[PDB]
Every structure is written in C-alpha cells, then in structure tokens.
C-alpha cells in the first residue's frame, strides 16, 4: 500500500537519524548509567563500582547502605527475575505497545482517507479531469473543474489541519519524554510516582 499512496504526489520523507544511530545512542546511555551512574550527565564521566552506586541510590531514599551490602545476592536475584518477567510479558501480549501503534494507525488512516477522497464528484459529473476535458468544452467544463478544485482543496486543508494538531500533541509528548530521559535516566528522581511506581 506504500507505493499506491505514493502514486499521488504523497511522499514520505525518511527520518534524519537511522535506527543504527538511535541504537548507538541508547547503548551509550546504558553504558554510561551502569559504569558511571549519574556524573556522566553533569560533566565528565567518573567510573564507580556498580555495587557502590547502588548503595548511593539506596542512601538516596532514606534506607541506609548497610541494607544493600548485606542483601546483595538477594537483590541481584530479584532484579534478574524482574528482567525476565519483563521480557516474558512483552513477548506474549499484543496490547502492550498500544500508543506507538495508535500513532501509526491514525497516520495511515488519515492518508487513506485523503487518497480515497480523490474519487468523489463534489457536484461535478465525474472525478477524472481528463474525462471532463475530453467530454466537454472549456466554457462549460471550467465550472466542473472549479467544483473539483474547490473540493480537493478543502480536503487538503482539513488534512493539513489534522496534521498540525497531531504534531502539536506529539510535540508535547516528546517534551515529556525528554524530561523523563533527563531526570530518570541521568540521575535518581524524587518526584513521587513520576519515574515509576514507588521509591525510584
């Protein structure tokens, strides 16, 4: 359906950042947050053993550190089991990635409506300019072509307005995601119930 949509001047520009670059970015963020904790978001990068960073993070929520160093194996086991639970939960249920599917669905739906709009009369006698031209004379064909032009222009207007509104909403969501990336990943947060559920 891609090229069929493409066949009416409706093209889809490719993104600037190909997927490999985004993958490199996320790998960089992971390596930084698991080898330096948070200082790599505030200047240079300063390495630190992972257990000590985890003890820093416990001390952040009131629990003194003698709790971690005396339950390291248990906490590691709980962490691993939780990661496994996450992986399993993703690979079984389809309604997990609801949002990211909704965006694609609504964009494809808008485009399909826009395309299918090009096959209605709008009051004229047909939906093919070549037909109306090859079946009438200018002095009486100009009214038909005017009707068709007005109709298609109106449809295009509605499409552009829809795109503007959706883009504003996605911009709000992207700013929210940037804030979450800046305050949850690059450092421990304390805004209750912001970066998860419970103490973070």
């Amino acid at each position: 359906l891609i090229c069929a949509q493409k066949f009416n001047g409706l093209t889809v520009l490719p993104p600037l950042l190909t997927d490999e670059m985004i993958a490199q970015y996320t790998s960089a963020l992971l390596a930084g947050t698991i080898t330096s904790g948070w200082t790599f978001g505030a200047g240079a990068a300063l390495q630190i053993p992972f257990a000590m960073q985890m003890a820093y993070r416990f001390n952040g929520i009131g629990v003194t550190q003698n709790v971690l160093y005396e339950n390291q194996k248990l906490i590691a086991n709980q962490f691993n089991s939780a990661i496994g639970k996450i992986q399993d939960s993703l690979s079984s249920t389809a309604s997990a990635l609801g949002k990211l599917q909704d965006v694609v669905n609504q964009n494809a739906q808008a485009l399909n409506t826009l395309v299918k709009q090009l096959s209605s009369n709008f009051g004229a006698i047909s939906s093919v300019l070549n037909d109306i031209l090859s079946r009438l004379d200018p002095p009486e064909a100009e009214v038909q072509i005017d009707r068709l032009i007005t109709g298609r222009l109106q449809s295009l207007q509605t499409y552009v307005t829809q795109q503007l509104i959706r883009a504003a909403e996605i911009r709000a969501s992207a700013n929210l995601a940037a804030t979450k990336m800046s305050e949850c990943v690059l450092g421990q947060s304390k805004r209750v119930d912001f970066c998860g559920k419970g103490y973070h």
Partner: protein, 299 residues
Amino acid sequence: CTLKSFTVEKGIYQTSNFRVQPTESIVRFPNIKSTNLVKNKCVNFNFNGLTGTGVLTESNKKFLPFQQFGRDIADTTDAVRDPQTLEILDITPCSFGGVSVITPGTNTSNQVAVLYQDVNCTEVNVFQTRAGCLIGAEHVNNSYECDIPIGAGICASYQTSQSIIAYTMSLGAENSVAYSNNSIAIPTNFTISVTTEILPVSMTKTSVDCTMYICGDSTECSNLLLQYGSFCTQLNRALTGIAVEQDKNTQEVFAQVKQIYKTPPIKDFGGFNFSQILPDPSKPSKRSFIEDLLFNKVT
C-alpha cells in the same frame, strides 16, 4: 527566486518538484486506429477509453476470463487486459520526486548541490544515497559533526579548492571508561559555568475586523455577508481571546513578586562583579547591559 531574496543562508531549500515525462503515447482499439505496444518505458497508454500514464510491465497475477481492470486498497488501475492481443499487463506510475538544493550560503560561495528525493537518477558528479540521489556533491569516507541534514544519516558541508561533501554523520568521540570492581574516580578541582536559555513568552497581540477586511467600506457587500451571520463575530471573539491570553502569559511569567526590592548602593558582594546584569541608572531607560545586548540583536 523561491525565497524572494538576493542572499540565501546556509541550509537546504526546496525548489519545484520533478516529473518524468511520457516518452510514447500508445492506444488500444478492438478489431472493428490501434497502434503498437511498448513495455518498461515511462509512457502514456490508452485502453478502450481508459486513459493513464505509467510503466506498462508484464503482469504476473492470474485474472479470471472476464476481468479487465485491476485495483488495490487505494483503487488505482494497475492492470489491464489487451483488447488487441489479449494480454494482462502491470502498471506502476512514474512521476515521482522532489527537487531540493543544498547551499552553504550566498555570503561564502555561489556553489550548490541538487538532491532528488526518491529517484535512482537514471534520469537526467553523481552519488547515490538512501534518500534519493545527490548531484554535485563529492562523497568522502570520514565522519564529522552534522551541519546540513539530508536524511537517512547523510550530512553535507562546504569545507574542503572548496567543494560540497556529503558524508555519514558521526555521533561523537567514542571512549570506554576503565570500569573495574574496585576502581573509582574522584574530582579534585571544579568549574563554574554560566549558560543561557532562551524562551518565547508572548507574540504580538494582533487583531482583525470582519467587515472592514472582507468588504471595504461598502454597503451591499455587508448585506451579502449577513447571510453567513455568526462567522466573523466568532472570529473576532477568538482573536481577542488570543490577545488576552498573551497578556496573561506575560503577567504570569514575570509578575511573581509583590514588592520591588532595590539593591543597596554598595557592591560588597563577597567578591563577585554583578555590574553587567544589574540595571544602570545612567541609561535612558532602566535596562542593564546584557538586556541591551539582547534588545539589539532582534531586528
């Protein structure tokens, strides 16, 4: 000509699009004038009144003995049966591509590069990308910071005896922290840093009149417009809403102190020199130095 200017700044702009042209106009009539058939060329065609243009290729989809056309989800004819030789063809339209231009700025050089958005450019130096193909730029093997984005991870720059180069962008310096289960890194000195951050607060409170714009100072024009009664009353309402919204925006961003504190005439601030940000009474208005610097760079 497109930007309506005589100086173009560094960046990517878009001129008119590009369209491949019909190289031949074939037609098909029943046995009762008909012409020859051609394939694999961006051509016009005609099948018993059915008019269109595309790339007439050989179909692989098995029709039924009574079917002529073919369609898709978008309802676009992409197969026809030959009323002369009884052949079912394929169709793939041909007019595809935008034409953009990369330019380092008409203050540096009068050199440009052209970019066709989705074309293999067997049409019309040449370098193929994942985002069309790029005429006039020379490919390199290095990787620099992105300057002019093309798409699909390609950035073009001017520096080189100069020429336009188009490379695969680089994310940054790649290092590896020597992480070790009993190793730590502790700072020993520090550094203060004063960065800036810009934020728009309010736009110009505009306003439009309904009848003075749609009509002039006419009479029968107003009496015609009164057939769309409640439109432009609503328009003026919306615009005054936007205006009062701008006013509220400024009020909220700035009016956060009930007092007006004056700094004392002495500057014994432990050693810091605030003289470049506190207001200056010698100024005609009551703006400070960096305030004026900002106020001049917006024209």
